[PDB]
Amino acid sequence: MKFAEHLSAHITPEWRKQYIQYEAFKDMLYSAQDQAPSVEVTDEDTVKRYFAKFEEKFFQTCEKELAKINTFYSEKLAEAQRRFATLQNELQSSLDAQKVQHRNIKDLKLAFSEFYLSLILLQNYQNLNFTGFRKILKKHDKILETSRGADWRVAHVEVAPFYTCKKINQLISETEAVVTNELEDGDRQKAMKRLRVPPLGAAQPAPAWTTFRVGLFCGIFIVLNITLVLAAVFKLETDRSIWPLIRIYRGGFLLIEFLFLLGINTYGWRQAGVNHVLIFELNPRSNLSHQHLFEIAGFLGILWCLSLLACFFAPISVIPTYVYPLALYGFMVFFLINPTKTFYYKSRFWLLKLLFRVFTAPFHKVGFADFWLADQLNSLSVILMDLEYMICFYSLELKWDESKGLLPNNSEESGICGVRAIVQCIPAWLRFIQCLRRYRDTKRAFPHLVNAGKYSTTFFMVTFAALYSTHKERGHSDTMVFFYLWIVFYIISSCYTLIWDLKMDWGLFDKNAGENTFLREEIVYPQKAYYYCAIIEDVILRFAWTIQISITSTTLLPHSGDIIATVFAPLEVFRRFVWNFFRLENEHLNNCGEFR
What we know:
mainly alpha
């Protein structure tokens, strides 16, 4: 509960291999002390010899660590000096060409903010490495009852060209002078507000009020869920179709679950070290922690349960029950498109810019955030089918003349209410067109043309499912050829998406696995059982995702298809939750998508 965990939490994740390696030294010291011979059953000269050999070993490995740190610091400082040179040349060129321009100035501001962050990170590297050297030499002096630790400290560590190099501080002062004089016309307060680096990474605890709001929204949600179960068992009339209600309130629940699991994903990414900040292109001084995602999910789930309870209980008699789902989803939309500057404005508007860039995306160049949201839409595809069902049900099947709305006595439609497939492929189409744009951009046909057929398989599966459904509904003869076609494309799609998940989305099953059998060379998440369980769960849940797509866009299994979809949709959201971890891990470790 000291500098070991302080070091693990304050390490820059991409430079983890070039730090002090505190725990190795600690284990070396403890093992040396443990296997020390006796003091009177053995010879004292042998004890002196053993302790001298251990001292030699310790100082050899300490010299190796110091050399590593010096090499890394020299490389990084040279890089920063070159970056400052080119940035000053760019600013000089832009400002003398000044006598568009706004975009140029914004990009210069952003480049100077990222140059400052690298300097701050290198400074923190220096500080942590020096403090780790002092603490471990102190532990050596304490464990062995000697003074060679502080001797080696004063002799070697405080001469090293990484503790005596006051060149990063000059660079920081120079950068501040540049940003203040040439980019802000004085006004150092505004420059430093843009340049100052808050304690980042796993090194910040969320405000107590955010955690209290998480806990408050979670308790209300829990009690309202208990109340929903009790009101479903004891208050729903036993002569009405509750299935329209289930279909309407299914998409909201999937959204709440997705936000909860995204919060858990953010916690795992922040803890294991894989920084979604650099991959998503978020600014490192302001991100959403897992607490904010948990709070958003809890609020939206509170609203969901309140609307469902109002549907079950019908509190007031003037307003019919179909207003409650409308109200819930209208508030959900008004939360997202809130034009004021309140309630997570930066996050919501980043998300809206992303949604405009994924729903119109043969024209925008694909980043990682444009790809992850279009991949997450594949799991949240039942939300679009729920929206289409809500529109169809309110336009064609709701009476509007009786307060008892969503729950009708007995009546149906042709299927359930063509355009129930198109709205299943929509996200597959987005990802297909994005992969095509990426191929056109990079001209590298392997990762992009492959992974475009990955979604053409979904296209073909939905098409042939719908064809066989309509042909078995009207009792035709060429129905069997279509059933075999659908089964072959189901197998093809399941294996295609399964191989891509494990091979070049997660990186697993590589030739250089080493001792991590069937895994990557370097794993980030602690337990090895996490990866094997994830493999098994993805194998199970990937096959029971194409089945749901086939059964949602069809008319077969009318009674059991809805139970199937209701059970399998949160399972698919959980599958995407599991997929996020290892996709993000294999993007930090190896560009898997060639972004960056």
